[PDB]
Design a binder for this molecule. Structure first.
Ligand SMILES: [Cu+2]
Ligand SMILES: [Cu+2]
Ligand SMILES: [Cu+2]
Length: 461
């Protein structure tokens, strides 16, 4: 009765150097009840696009939805033209082709809609896919690499459903304040699936694909997780942890030992968002069952994985300050609402959340950043106690200060997201590619309902 963990197709180019992605609506079943869902190349979620560093691929994108959408390639160091800006809106029945030039270390990135004001809803409906970047360096390590066997993507997402089974998503005052949270946890679209893993090392490419919920991975029997990669790729050495917090939109790759016939679970532990943990995420929650099989796998975990460049001197680097702000009444409303779950004048919430006192204006980039030079961006969330995972397009950056303190070792490598939660973060960013006004990059909170209600800025390079 325990469903098998679905494995996204790992797609490579055809003989024409092309990959096709179709965006469309279908049906899925959750807990025995059908729901209308959206997917790439299917009814729900999407495939994993395989890229090779230093090689070009062209992606043909067909929008079969009845509304506009866009595609954001989260974590890719690509020109702003790839996401597209206004030219990046794909009308119903429209086609968009993008040629991806992959010039960054091996990493697990992802892709998802980014229509402003509607990103939360389109992700909630089902749209997300993966990007697997490979390079020469990672292949020489002889990591677990049999996709779907000992090298497995694990996209973890919550959803809220109505009584009839349909996805229950509404961007209203309360969801704009706190985010969209559900009580049903999905793993590659399935409820508590199991994966059969050969003996030895099992590699999990973890993605927190929730709109607003932070996760904290561990195992049911407290066996450790060996973190080998963050958002932007390999760490210099594996970092062993007993638990692994993962913010919305973040990825980590971990190895876990499969050493006998005893099944065990990947779980997620309670997280305080504000300072409340709400059922059914107020105690450890299963994510998926790992079922050992008698076959042994040959993946290895070397002592050294990669090399990170030394941080440059901070003297002389441009400093950019970004102040996140939540509307005080959304902030208050959200605190009271969570306190109860845990236990007029013309206001428009669609532009109520802000950066540097401005809600996102698609026609006015806030600044231009330098191309090819390190900058220090300082992001403050001092006005409220909510979690804002801050994401910057076009770069894999280094965290200098995460929410007031130097980053943990497994978060000190390549990142595209930094925690901001009532304190101040500082990141060292470099943009290798152009993004003109008509194809501007974005920087924003990745709690999707916050960015949909104004907590985003555009910038050019
Ligand atoms: Cu994203
Ligand atoms: Cu936020
Ligand atoms: Cu974004």
């Amino acid at each position: 009765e325990r469903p098998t963990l679905p494995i996204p197709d790992l797609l490579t180019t055809d003989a024409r150097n092309r990959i096709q992605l179709t965006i469309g609506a279908g049906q899925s079943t959750f807990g025995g009840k059908t729901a209308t869902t959206w997917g790439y190349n299917g009814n729900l979620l999407g495939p994993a696009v395989k890229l090779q560093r230093g090689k070009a691929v062209t992606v043909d994108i067909y929008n079969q939805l009845t509304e506009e959408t866009t595609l954001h390639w989260h974590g890719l160091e690509v020109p702003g033209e790839v996401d597209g800006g206004p030219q990046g809106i794909i009308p119903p029945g429209g086609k968009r082709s993008v040629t991806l030039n992959v010039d960054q270390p091996a990493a697990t990135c992802w892709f998802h809609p980014h229509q402003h004001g509607k990103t939360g809803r389109q992700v909630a409906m089902g749209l997300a896919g993966l990007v697997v970047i490979e390079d020469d360096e990672i292949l020489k390590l002889m990591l677990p690499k049999q996709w779907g066997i000992d090298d497995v993507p694990v996209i973890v997402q919550d959803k809220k459903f109505s009584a009839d089974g349909q996805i229950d998503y509404q961007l209203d005052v309360m969801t704009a304040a706190v985010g969209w949270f559900g009580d049903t946890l999905l793993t590659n679209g399935a409820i508590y699936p199991q994966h059969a893993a050969p003996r030895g090392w099992l590699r999990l490419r973890l993605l927190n694909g929730c709109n607003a919920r932070s996760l904290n991975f561990a195992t049911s029997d407290n066996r450790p997780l060996y973190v080998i990669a963050s958002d932007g790729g390999l760490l210099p050495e594996p970092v062993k942890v007993s638990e692994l917090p993962v913010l919305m939109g973040e990825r980590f790759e971990v190895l876990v030992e499969v050493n006998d016939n005893k099944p065990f679970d990947l779980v997620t532990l309670p997280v305080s968002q504000m300072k409340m943990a709400i059922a059914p995420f107020d105690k450890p929650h299963p994510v998926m069952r790992i079922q050992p099989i008698a076959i042994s796998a040959s993946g290895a975990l070397p002592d050294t994985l990669s090399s990170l460049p030394a941080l440059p001197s901070l003297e002389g680097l441009t400093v950019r300050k970004l102040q996140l702000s939540m509307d005080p009444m959304l902030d208050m409303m959200g605190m009271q609402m969570l306190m109860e779950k845990y236990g007029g004048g013309k206001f428009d919430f669609h532009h109520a959340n802000k950066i540097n006192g401005q809600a996102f204006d698609m026609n006015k980039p806030m600044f231009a950043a330098a191309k090819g030079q390190y900058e220090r961006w300082v992001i403050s969330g001092v006005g409220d106690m909510m979690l804002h995972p801050f994401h910057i397009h076009g770069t894999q950056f280094r965290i200098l200060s995460e929410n007031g303190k130097p980053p943990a070792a497994h978060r000190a490598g390549w990142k595209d997201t930094v925690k901001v939660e009532g304190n101040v973060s500082e990141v060292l960013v470099k943009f290798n590619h152009d993004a003109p006004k008509e194809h501007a990059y974005m920087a924003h909170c990745h709690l999707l309902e916050h960015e949909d209600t104004g907590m985003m800025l555009g910038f050019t390079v």
